Design a protein around this ligand. Sequence first.
Ligand SMILES: [Cl-]
Length: 257
Amino acid sequence: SMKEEIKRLAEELKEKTKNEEIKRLAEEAAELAERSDDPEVLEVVKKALEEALKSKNEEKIELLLLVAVLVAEAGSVDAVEEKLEIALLALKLAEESKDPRIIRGALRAAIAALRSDDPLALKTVKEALERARASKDERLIRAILAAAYAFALLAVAGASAERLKEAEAIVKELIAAAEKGASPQELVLLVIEMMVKGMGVTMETHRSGNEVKVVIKGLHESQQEVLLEAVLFAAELMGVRVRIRFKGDTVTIVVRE
Ligand SMILES: [Cl-]
């Protein structure tokens, strides 16, 4: 049957991985598929699991399993059309590009968007992925994806709705600046600014020579981890070397032009 094949695919996937979250999604997928009545759903789960088994990219596998869980938990592919379209966009961009940074940015932005279940984050990431696919500027694509990931991460972390609304103005500012040739270092500064705004903390910037020092005060340990994930991911995507210092509850992020 369809379900027995799906359970074997999930069983194989969950033993092959060392990633505990992929293991949990594989099991959730198998259980939801077991209870599924909709053959359209079962087809999508099977094709997601088969594709995951053929992949060596763990972010791609996470995205595919998230798709399978979403469709199977919903009962229909139509109920999750927007999330499905975001995942397809990311999967298309990931096979259309050879840059490992673009591949990783597309899949991670889509994963975070889907996990957020946040209307504004879903729409912003969908548009970012469309904009990246229409662009031939790989530098701009990498900046678009870094902004989209940081934004979706704020949503995943439960930023207040009003702080996320204001963070979207910084997404727009970053993308506009990138299109006008702004430096990778200034685009990283904008990702820092977006995170500081999204988390309700404060920042001061100090520039001397070719070094820019951003001092961020009032970060809790939970906020520290979210801000540094977005900022280090952005620095990896845009090829920026970043250094970090910590004293008390103060984080200092150093960028060199
Ligand atoms: Cl096999």
